[PDB]
Design a protein around this motif. Structure first.
Motif, PDB file in Angstrom:
ATOM      1  N   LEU A 272      43.555  17.070  38.248  1.00 19.27           N
ATOM      2  CA  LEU A 272      44.610  16.066  38.512  1.00 19.27           C
ATOM      3  C   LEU A 272      44.240  14.739  37.876  1.00 19.27           C
ATOM      4  O   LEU A 272      45.080  14.092  37.217  1.00 19.27           O
ATOM      5  CB  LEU A 272      44.781  15.940  40.024  1.00 19.27           C
ATOM      6  CG  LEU A 272      45.330  17.186  40.768  1.00 19.27           C
ATOM      7  CD1 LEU A 272      45.409  16.871  42.220  1.00 19.27           C
ATOM      8  CD2 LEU A 272      46.671  17.681  40.248  1.00 19.27           C
ATOM      9  N   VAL A 292      48.614  20.558  29.737  1.00 19.92           N
ATOM     10  CA  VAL A 292      48.431  21.930  29.365  1.00 19.92           C
ATOM     11  C   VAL A 292      47.637  22.687  30.433  1.00 19.92           C
ATOM     12  O   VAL A 292      47.853  23.816  30.764  1.00 19.92           O
ATOM     13  CB  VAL A 292      47.752  22.053  27.959  1.00 19.92           C
ATOM     14  CG1 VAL A 292      47.680  23.545  27.682  1.00 19.92           C
ATOM     15  CG2 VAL A 292      48.520  21.294  26.896  1.00 19.92           C
ATOM     16  N   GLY A 293      46.644  22.039  31.027  1.00 18.58           N
ATOM     17  CA  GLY A 293      45.727  22.498  32.047  1.00 18.58           C
ATOM     18  C   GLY A 293      46.484  22.781  33.359  1.00 18.58           C
ATOM     19  O   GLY A 293      47.451  22.148  33.749  1.00 18.58           O
ATOM     20  N   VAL A 294      45.966  23.833  34.017  1.00 12.99           N
ATOM     21  CA  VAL A 294      46.552  24.264  35.289  1.00 12.99           C
ATOM     22  C   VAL A 294      45.604  23.718  36.358  1.00 12.99           C
ATOM     23  O   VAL A 294      44.441  24.039  36.255  1.00 12.99           O
ATOM     24  CB  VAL A 294      46.521  25.788  35.376  1.00 12.99           C
ATOM     25  CG1 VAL A 294      46.904  26.215  36.771  1.00 12.99           C
ATOM     26  CG2 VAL A 294      47.344  26.352  34.242  1.00 12.99           C
ATOM     27  N   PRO A 295      46.114  22.959  37.282  1.00 15.26           N
ATOM     28  CA  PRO A 295      45.360  22.346  38.366  1.00 15.26           C
ATOM     29  C   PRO A 295      45.378  23.287  39.529  1.00 15.26           C
ATOM     30  O   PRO A 295      46.083  24.280  39.593  1.00 15.26           O
ATOM     31  CB  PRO A 295      46.156  21.044  38.688  1.00 15.26           C
ATOM     32  CG  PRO A 295      47.570  21.512  38.410  1.00 15.26           C
ATOM     33  CD  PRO A 295      47.549  22.613  37.345  1.00 15.26           C
ATOM     34  N   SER A 298      49.086  24.010  44.618  1.00 18.59           N
ATOM     35  CA  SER A 298      49.644  23.132  45.627  1.00 18.59           C
ATOM     36  C   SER A 298      49.038  21.749  45.674  1.00 18.59           C
ATOM     37  O   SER A 298      49.240  21.055  46.696  1.00 18.59           O
ATOM     38  CB  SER A 298      49.452  23.815  47.006  1.00 18.59           C
ATOM     39  OG  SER A 298      50.258  25.014  47.005  1.00 18.59           O
ATOM     40  N   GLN A 299      48.314  21.185  44.747  1.00 19.29           N
ATOM     41  CA  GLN A 299      47.807  19.833  44.936  1.00 19.29           C
ATOM     42  C   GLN A 299      48.628  18.816  44.157  1.00 19.29           C
ATOM     43  O   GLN A 299      49.070  18.996  43.042  1.00 19.29           O
ATOM     44  CB  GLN A 299      46.345  19.697  44.465  1.00 19.29           C
ATOM     45  CG  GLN A 299      45.471  20.449  45.496  1.00 19.29           C
ATOM     46  CD  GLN A 299      44.000  20.188  45.175  1.00 19.29           C
ATOM     47  OE1 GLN A 299      43.681  19.080  44.662  1.00 19.29           O
ATOM     48  NE2 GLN A 299      43.073  21.132  45.442  1.00 19.29           N
ATOM     49  N   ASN A 300      48.861  17.688  44.778  1.00 17.91           N
ATOM     50  CA  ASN A 300      49.619  16.617  44.173  1.00 17.91           C
ATOM     51  C   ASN A 300      48.664  15.581  43.589  1.00 17.91           C
ATOM     52  O   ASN A 300      47.538  15.295  44.049  1.00 17.91           O
ATOM     53  CB  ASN A 300      50.538  15.981  45.221  1.00 17.91           C
ATOM     54  CG  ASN A 300      51.804  16.811  45.328  1.00 17.91           C
ATOM     55  OD1 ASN A 300      51.878  17.999  45.009  1.00 17.91           O
ATOM     56  ND2 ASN A 300      52.818  16.127  45.795  1.00 17.91           N
TER      57      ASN A 300
ATOM     58  N   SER B 302      53.359  10.420  44.430  1.00 18.95           N
ATOM     59  CA  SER B 302      52.615  11.687  44.540  1.00 18.95           C
ATOM     60  C   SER B 302      53.537  12.803  44.035  1.00 18.95           C
ATOM     61  O   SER B 302      54.696  12.930  44.432  1.00 18.95           O
ATOM     62  CB  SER B 302      52.224  11.812  45.979  1.00 18.95           C
ATOM     63  OG  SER B 302      51.529  12.979  46.272  1.00 18.95           O
ATOM     64  N   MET B 303      53.013  13.623  43.119  1.00 24.68           N
ATOM     65  CA  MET B 303      53.855  14.696  42.583  1.00 24.68           C
ATOM     66  C   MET B 303      53.055  15.899  42.136  1.00 24.68           C
ATOM     67  O   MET B 303      51.864  15.838  41.831  1.00 24.68           O
ATOM     68  CB  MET B 303      54.782  14.242  41.451  1.00 24.68           C
ATOM     69  CG  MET B 303      54.105  13.740  40.219  1.00 24.68           C
ATOM     70  SD  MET B 303      53.477  14.925  39.040  1.00 24.68           S
ATOM     71  CE  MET B 303      55.079  15.560  38.484  1.00 24.68           C
ATOM     72  N   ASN B 304      53.752  17.060  42.116  1.00 21.58           N
ATOM     73  CA  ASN B 304      53.025  18.251  41.700  1.00 21.58           C
ATOM     74  C   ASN B 304      53.202  18.438  40.208  1.00 21.58           C
ATOM     75  O   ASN B 304      54.330  18.588  39.774  1.00 21.58           O
ATOM     76  CB  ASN B 304      53.575  19.425  42.509  1.00 21.58           C
ATOM     77  CG  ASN B 304      52.800  20.713  42.134  1.00 21.58           C
ATOM     78  OD1 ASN B 304      52.222  20.874  41.043  1.00 21.58           O
ATOM     79  ND2 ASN B 304      52.888  21.530  43.157  1.00 21.58           N
ATOM     80  N   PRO B 305      52.144  18.472  39.431  1.00 20.56           N
ATOM     81  CA  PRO B 305      52.152  18.615  37.997  1.00 20.56           C
ATOM     82  C   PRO B 305      52.804  19.885  37.504  1.00 20.56           C
ATOM     83  O   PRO B 305      53.157  19.892  36.318  1.00 20.56           O
ATOM     84  CB  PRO B 305      50.716  18.399  37.480  1.00 20.56           C
ATOM     85  CG  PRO B 305      49.927  18.386  38.733  1.00 20.56           C
ATOM     86  CD  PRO B 305      50.781  18.286  39.948  1.00 20.56           C
ATOM     87  N   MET B 306      53.024  20.906  38.296  1.00 24.43           N
ATOM     88  CA  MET B 306      53.693  22.137  37.892  1.00 24.43           C
ATOM     89  C   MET B 306      55.144  21.829  37.519  1.00 24.43           C
ATOM     90  O   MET B 306      55.728  22.608  36.742  1.00 24.43           O
ATOM     91  CB  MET B 306      53.593  23.300  38.875  1.00 24.43           C
ATOM     92  CG  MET B 306      54.247  24.615  38.664  1.00 24.43           C
ATOM     93  SD  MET B 306      53.916  25.975  37.504  1.00 24.43           S
ATOM     94  CE  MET B 306      52.105  26.035  37.442  1.00 24.43           C
ATOM     95  N   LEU B 309      54.545  21.180  33.890  1.00 21.84           N
ATOM     96  CA  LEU B 309      54.024  22.379  33.239  1.00 21.84           C
ATOM     97  C   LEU B 309      55.105  23.422  32.958  1.00 21.84           C
ATOM     98  O   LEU B 309      54.952  24.096  31.927  1.00 21.84           O
ATOM     99  CB  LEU B 309      52.780  22.800  34.034  1.00 21.84           C
ATOM    100  CG  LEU B 309      51.775  23.561  33.213  1.00 21.84           C
ATOM    101  CD1 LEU B 309      50.948  22.652  32.324  1.00 21.84           C
ATOM    102  CD2 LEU B 309      50.773  24.345  34.088  1.00 21.84           C
TER     103      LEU B 309
END
Ligand SMILES: NC(=O)c1ccc[n+]([C@@H]2O[C@H](COP(=O)([O-])OP(=O)(O)OC[C@H]3O[C@@H](n4cnc5c(N)ncnc54)[C@H](O)[C@@H]3O)[C@@H](O)[C@H]2O)c1
Ligand SMILES: NC(=O)c1ccc[n+]([C@@H]2O[C@H](COP(=O)([O-])OP(=O)(O)OC[C@H]3O[C@@H](n4cnc5c(N)ncnc54)[C@H](O)[C@@H]3O)[C@@H](O)[C@H]2O)c1
Ligand SMILES: O=CNC1CCCCC1
Ligand SMILES: O=CNC1CCCCC1
Ligand SMILES: [Zn+2]
Ligand SMILES: [Zn+2]
Ligand SMILES: [Zn+2]
Ligand SMILES: [Zn+2]
Lengths: 374, 374
Positions: A272, A292-295, A298-300, B302-306, B309
């Motif tokens: 993140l 590009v990276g997958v975190p 479920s984390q914000n 606060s936000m989810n990067p997905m 992606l």
């Protein structure tokens, strides 16, 4: 010979999180309508497969992971029209159904039939073609290539050039394409620009390749593992920086190095914090940053919207933005034509049975892409 | 007659946060080299001005706020070459030095000489041309239009057509341009697309107008104040939704209504939550969401990067992405040519002295844009 029959073969089963893969005997059902059974020839170990093991990427267990590969069609179910037995093919982790709104959109590639957003870990029909110890084993992104034989939906497979070297073009199934398309198709890197690539593993090096192919004038590789610098420089990085060497936050260092912010930054790690850092380091008025990276699931992340209000552009993509069925075959053709290199990403080659060893090399920092041969 | 002399005039001084404006006598110094003294003819009340009173937007106090206006050059300092006494002009809150890396960039507009990133509240030379009660009063975004007379840097002013109606074209100094450009220049709204505009105040309606000019097919207005709907529909909204009327989160509602997510979404309010909501409502593989609203100082969202992606594009801009000095004069020309309308934004007209009344109308939800005349 095996057409229409259940095949018993070896596959790497992941029974539980944070456990080594278990090489065991599985039963692979024959392909149903519109399904293709493939004999695997080569498969690379991508960080996303390790994310399944570590719990970073959530998908139903137990499962046969593997999504970066190349094989030969062993047989096809009724109705398949795009591939034939004997064809060389590359399974597609992001399908291309060609009929949904995204597939019909000029810039979309995240086909609505994907198994990424709400993972079911099955075939398009809701069922599994894998059985182990009498129990159904989940599929992974409609590919599951960590098996001698796999069963994929027709929309999840692409026919490639009969003379392509499967032990090299499997990287086009994930790594390379993701990396390269991110730079060249999502970011749309421009001639003479300055780029910042965070994470120098296989996708980052491919990101570097795309930036160099786009004409970037400066390509700053960033990594906390100095041993990645050398190979980064080899595919195009004009400079490499290690955040651990500086007393100030890496975004300040890069802003100063680029005299006010880079034109294009890429997060190819899966953190993140580096996602936020990679956005900050791009020029406040016209910079573009691509995640590009997958975190971790479920984390914000937390960020200040003024970073965007000044004019920055923030974006992400799956598989470098490429429409899978249509670009996979072309990328192989171009590879065949020597338009890009795959060798610099391949640092180790191992027989499939040594998969845990391959995961240990990736986890230890020693390899880029280990290719598993069957 | 007043050239070269200190002018005594009335100005609305903001001495402290959350307090009414103080209409009082101020001393406006004569313009120094490359400076232009303007006699204000009309000024609009934008929500960003209210943000200075509420503390949402931080800038040094005491201050002479106001940034959306139009007036006539009273005199020019040594060296000015772009405007002359008698010219009609529009003060530029976002300068256009034309020499910095952003000014020189094809897509940048956030000139490095701006007073927005690290607000100093002064002229380019670090000093103020305003005195009140014996004390120096800060400038605001190099404009300070809530005064009968103001002094601006040459790079912060644009000469406009001599026949333009100053009580209408002052909206091009902020609200209208911001909105319109956001749709047409930053989002680059396409023909036949579906748009979602959050916030139906002055900037929101101008975002609507740009969507309508770009050929959008559907334009959904979103606002918790149903009284804004009518006007929204009058400038192009095809449907309007009020989040308080549904039991489910507005982003699900809008995703359903667009059958999967809009092509273009706009946050034109100034809330962290709406910013995240507007991004989610845009189609996950190819949607584009633009932040226009200014959120409370120093707060992170606060936000989810997905969300990024899968393929979304997230961006922001100041002044609808327009290079200020070049576009303002063209925007007036186009308004003169009837290419867009300003009347629909103007719902109240008041004499400058009634400034507090004008802020009351804005805060009460009754107006869109109140124009103040001198
Ligand atoms: N969006 C997509 O479609 C797609 C496709 C493939 C992979 N990915 C994701 O892209 C990432 C890259 O994959 P890979 O296979 O190249 O992995 P990798 O593990 O080979 O590479 C990651 C690199 O980042 C470095 N790194 C780690 N922590 C760092 C930190 N704090 N700061 C700077 N550098 C740091 C490592 O040392 C390593 O070289 C993964 O997170 C993977 O899941 C996304
Ligand atoms: N980026 C720029 O360059 C620029 C230029 C001008 C204004 N702005 C900002 O744009 C915003 C819009 O300004 P305006 O002058 O049109 O203001 P405004 O207050 O007239 O309009 C905001 C609207 O949003 C609505 N709203 C409030 N809370 C809401 C919620 N929770 N959900 C949905 N709708 C809600 C209100 O009812 C109101 O109609 C402000 O925050 C202002 O500071 C930015
Ligand atoms: O590795 C291939 N694909 C990745 C794409 C992003 C989420 C995890 C799977
Ligand atoms: O209202 C005019 N401009 C806004 C630009 C975004 C920051 C605050 C001021
Ligand atoms: Zn599709
Ligand atoms: Zn992968
Ligand atoms: Zn404004
Ligand atoms: Zn400039």
């Amino acid at each position: 010979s095996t057409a229409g029959k259940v095949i018993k073969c070896k596959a790497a089963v992941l029974w539980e999180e944070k456990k080594p893969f278990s090489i065991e005997e599985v039963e692979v059902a024959p392909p149903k309508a519109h399904e293709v059974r493939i004999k695997m020839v080569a498969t690379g170990i991508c960080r996303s497969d390790d994310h399944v093991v570590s719990g970073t990427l959530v998908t139903p267990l137990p499962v046969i992971a593997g999504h970066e590969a190349a094989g030969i069609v062993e047989s096809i179910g009724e109705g398949v029209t795009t591939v034939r037995p004997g064809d060389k093919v590359i399974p597609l982790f992001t399908p291309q159904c060609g009929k949904c709104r995204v597939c019909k959109h000029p810039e979309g590639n995240f086909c609505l039939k994907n198994d990424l957003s709400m993972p079911r870990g099955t075939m398009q029909d809701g069922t599994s073609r894998f059985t182990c110890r009498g129990k159904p084993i989940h599929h992974f992104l409609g590919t599951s290539t960590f098996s001698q034989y796999t069963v994929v939906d027709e929309i999840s497979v692409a026919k490639i050039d009969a003379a392509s070297p499967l032990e090299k073009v499997c990287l086009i199934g994930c790594g390379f394409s993701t990396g390269y398309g991110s730079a060249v198709k999502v970011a749309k890197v421009t001639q003479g620009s300055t780029c910042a690539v965070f994470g120098l593993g296989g996708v980052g090096l491919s990101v570097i390749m795309g930036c160099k192919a786009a004409g970037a004038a400066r390509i700053i590789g960033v990594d906390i593992n100095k041993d990645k610098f050398a190979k980064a420089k080899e595919v195009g990085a004009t400079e490499c920086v290690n955040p651990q060497d500086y007393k100030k936050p890496i975004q300040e260092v890069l802003t100063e190095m680029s005299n006010g912010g880079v034109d294009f930054s890429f997060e190819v790690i899966g953190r993140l914090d580096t996602m936020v850092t990679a956005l900050s380091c791009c020029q406040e008025a016209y910079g573009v940053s691509v995640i590009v990276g997958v975190p971790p699931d479920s984390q914000n992340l937390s960020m200040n919207p003024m970073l965007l209000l000044s004019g920055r552009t923030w974006k992400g993509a799956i598989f470098g933005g490429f429409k899978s069925k249509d670009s996979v075959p072309k990328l192989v053709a171009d590879f065949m034509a020597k338009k890009f290199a795959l060798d610099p990403l391949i640092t180790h080659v191992l027989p499939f049975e040594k998969i845990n060893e391959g995961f240990d090399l990736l986890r230890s920092g020693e390899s880029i892409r280990t290719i598993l041969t069957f």
